[PDB]
Structure formats: structure tokens, C-alpha cells
């Protein structure tokens, strides 16, 4: 019964996505419509600035990508993926792209602004989240991954740094630099070292299952306060990931441990989210027995934590960064490479 309604939701959600996917929105604003206030982050590539749209007085987070820097880092195809996917999608725990445009020098992606900061800041500061607090957030990622994978999208960069906390204490996934629409396998080495599935490390050719492995890393990090595999250098992290051993805090409930052994499973035929019953092997698990999935989607569950509102354009929940000027050259750079943007 439950599953047939999920099916119906997802079929309607796919029709919506396809229209925007085959016909992307393009050139929907211009830089001179925004007042630049402050740099509030750096992503996989580029920088993100608090801005204010003059015509509405809305505040937004604008990501700026230097087209020449993107070509040198061989991210052309990934940045086109990123804007094409983000303009097409629509789900409550995905940050919304409000405008996109480009000029002679840069690409711009203007997104809704979450003044509360990201899970990284809050997690590091308090040390670790309780299990109920961790499950509240995990549940949102489980549904989001359910939404994305049904559209044939792999996300490929789950980590606390990419999860914004809204004014209701719910998540928005906020960086799509590696998101990709693929049916079947793909091979690019990308993601963040602590979060990489063993099949990525081993140049093996992978699918959506790497997102579920990354979920296991996230849950563990939220509940332990540190990642399951850590070291001072990436190569030392990769050895630990491929070894196939993992150790849990003594405070993890036996159900948490058993969820996590099934997500951090090196064996792809045994890894939860991958099997015949897909996402329901996760959703029906015991660690999740208290979770009401519809109440999470609707935002009826009480959030464990609500960031302090110090205004629509307050930036105290982000760190300070170096301010680079936006330089727009008088000549067009990389026109052909980015024509579809």
C-alpha cells in the first residue's frame, strides 16, 4: 500500500523533471540585479557570495565560476551537468536554483539563501549529534536519494559541508558539482576522500550505490562526531576504506551498528540501497522504526535544532573568506564550451 503511493509520487516527479531536463531554463537574470554583500563559502569549485536582489529585496547565495578556471580543471561537462540538473529538480531538501546566467568571464548560479549555516559548523561545534538527532537528518537524505536516483541522478558528494540547515531546522543539499544523470555505470574519480566508496578508490566503475555508502559515512560521522575512516592524508584514508574493517564507538546502539555494517559494505551485492528491495531495505530497518517518512517529507516532525535568526541577510553562521573582485573581461571567454549554460 505504502509503496504504491511512493511509486505514484515518483512517476509524477519524473514527468516534471523531464520537461525541464529536455528544455532547460537559461539566462534568467543579470549580475547588475544583485548587490554583493559577502563571500560565505567555497564549494568543490568556485565561491559563493551573499547577495541581495534589488527588485525584490530577497537575499540569495550566488555561486560564481570562472569559466577559464573550470576549463583548466576539466570540469566543463560537470558544470553543465550541475546547472542542468539543479534547474530541473524540485524536492523539499534540495536547495532551489532561482536564477542562472553568464557573462564574458563567469558563470553564475543564484540559489536560495540559508542563513543558518551548514551541518559541518554545527556538528563540529557540538561534537556529535544524539541518535534521534542524527536519524532526523539521515531520514531526509534517504528520501532525497530516493528522489534523485529515481530520476537516474547520482549525487556523489554527500558530507556535512554540503548540507545547509534552514530556518525550520531541516536540510537542503547545496552543491551539485558532481551530480550526473546516468543509467548504468560511470567511472569518474570524484567526491571527498572520507566519503568515497571502495569501488571509486579502486577505479572500478560504479553506480548509485556509492551514494548509499556515503550515507553510511554521514550517519556515522553525525553520531560519532568523527568519520569512520580518517587520517592525516588521503592515501591513508583510502587504505582504511579498502581494508574492509570499521570500528564503532561503544555508545552506538546495536541497531545503528547493524544499519552501518550494511551501508559500509564493501560487497556491492550485499550493500543496502543496492539490492532487489532498493531503498526499502533502509527505510524498513529497525534504527528507522520510529521514523514517520511522510511526516519528514511534509516537515511535521519537530526539529532537534533551529538556527538563531539574526536577520534575512545575517552572515555570522558562516566563516570569513578572502574577498576577490568579480572581473568581467571585455572579451568573451569559452563561449562554445559553455553555450548551453
Amino acid at each position: 500500500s505504502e509503496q504504491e503511493s511512493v511509486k505514484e509520487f515518483l512517476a509524477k516527479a519524473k514527468e516534471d523533471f523531464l520537461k525541464k531536463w529536455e528544455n532547460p531554463a537559461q539566462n534568467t537574470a543579470h549580475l547588475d540585479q544583485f548587490e554583493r554583500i559577502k563571500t560565505i563559502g567555497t564549494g568543490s569549485f568556485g565561491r559563493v557570495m551573499l547577495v541581495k536582489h534589488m527588485e525584490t529585496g530577497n537575499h540569495y547565495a550566488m555561486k560564481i565560476l570562472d569559466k577559464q578556471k573550470v576549463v583548466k580543471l576539466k570540469q566543463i561537462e560537470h558544470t553543465l551537468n550541475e546547472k542542468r540538473i539543479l534547474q530541473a529538480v524540485n524536492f523539499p531538501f534540495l536547495v532551489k536554483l532561482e536564477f542562472s546566467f553568464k557573462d564574458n568571464s563567469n558563470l553564475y548560479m543564484v540559489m536560495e539563501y540559508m542563513p543558518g549555516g551548514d551541518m559541518f559548523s554545527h556538528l563540529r561545534r557540538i561534537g556529535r549529534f544524539s541518535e534521534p538527532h542524527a536519524r532526523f537528518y539521515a531520514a531526509q537524505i534517504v528520501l532525497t536519494f530516493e528522489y534523485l536516483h529515481s530520476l537516474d541522478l547520482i549525487y556523489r558528494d554527500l558530507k556535512p559541508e554540503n548540507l545547509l540547515i534552514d530556518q525550520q531546522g531541516y536540510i537542503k543539499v547545496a552543491d551539485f558539482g558532481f551530480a550526473k544523470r546516468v543509467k548504468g555505470r560511470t567511472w569518474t574519480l570524484c567526491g571527498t576522500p572520507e566519503y568515497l566508496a571502495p569501488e571509486i578508490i579502486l577505479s572500478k566503475g560504479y553506480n548509485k550505490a556509492v551514494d548509499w555508502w556515503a550515507l553510511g559515512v554521514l550517519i556515522y560521522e553525525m553520531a560519532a562526531g568523527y568519520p569512520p575512516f580518517f587520517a592525516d592524508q588521503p592515501i591513508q584514508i583510502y587504505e582504511k576504506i579498502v581494508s574492509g574493517k570499521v570500528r564503532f564507538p561503544s555508545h552506538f546502539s546495536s541497531d545503528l551498528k547493524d544499519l552501518l555494517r550494511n551501508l559500509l559494505q564493501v560487497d556491492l551485492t550485499k550493500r543496502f540501497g543496492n539490492l532487489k528491495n532498493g531503498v526499502n531495505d533502509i527505510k524498513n530497518h529497525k534504527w528507522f522504526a520510529t521514523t514517520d517518512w511522510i511526516a519528514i517529507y511534509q516537515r511535521k516532525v519537530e526539529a532537534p535544532f533551529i538556527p538563531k535568526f539574526k536577520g534575512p541577510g545575517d552572515t555570522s553562521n558562516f566563516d570569513d573568506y578572502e574577498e576577490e573582485e568579480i572581473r568581467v573581461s571585455i572579451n568573451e571567454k569559452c563561449g562554445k564550451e559553455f553555450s548551453e549554460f
Binding site: 568543490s44 561534537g127 558528494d157 558530507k159 569518474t188 571527498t192 576522500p193 568519520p227 587520517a231
Partner: peptide
């Protein structure tokens, strides 16, 4: 403790994505 080893490690700040 494991928490103490992590907190003394060089990877407690924001982690960059990797690539080819």
C-alpha cells in the same frame, strides 16, 4: 581516545572534493 586523535588530526576543517 579516537575523538582526541581526530581532533589533533589535520582533517577537522572543511574538506575539499578531489578529482583527476
Amino acid at each position: 581516545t579516537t575523538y582526541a586523535d581526530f581532533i589533533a588530526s589535520g582533517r577537522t576543517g572543511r574538506r575539499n572534493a578531489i578529482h583527476d
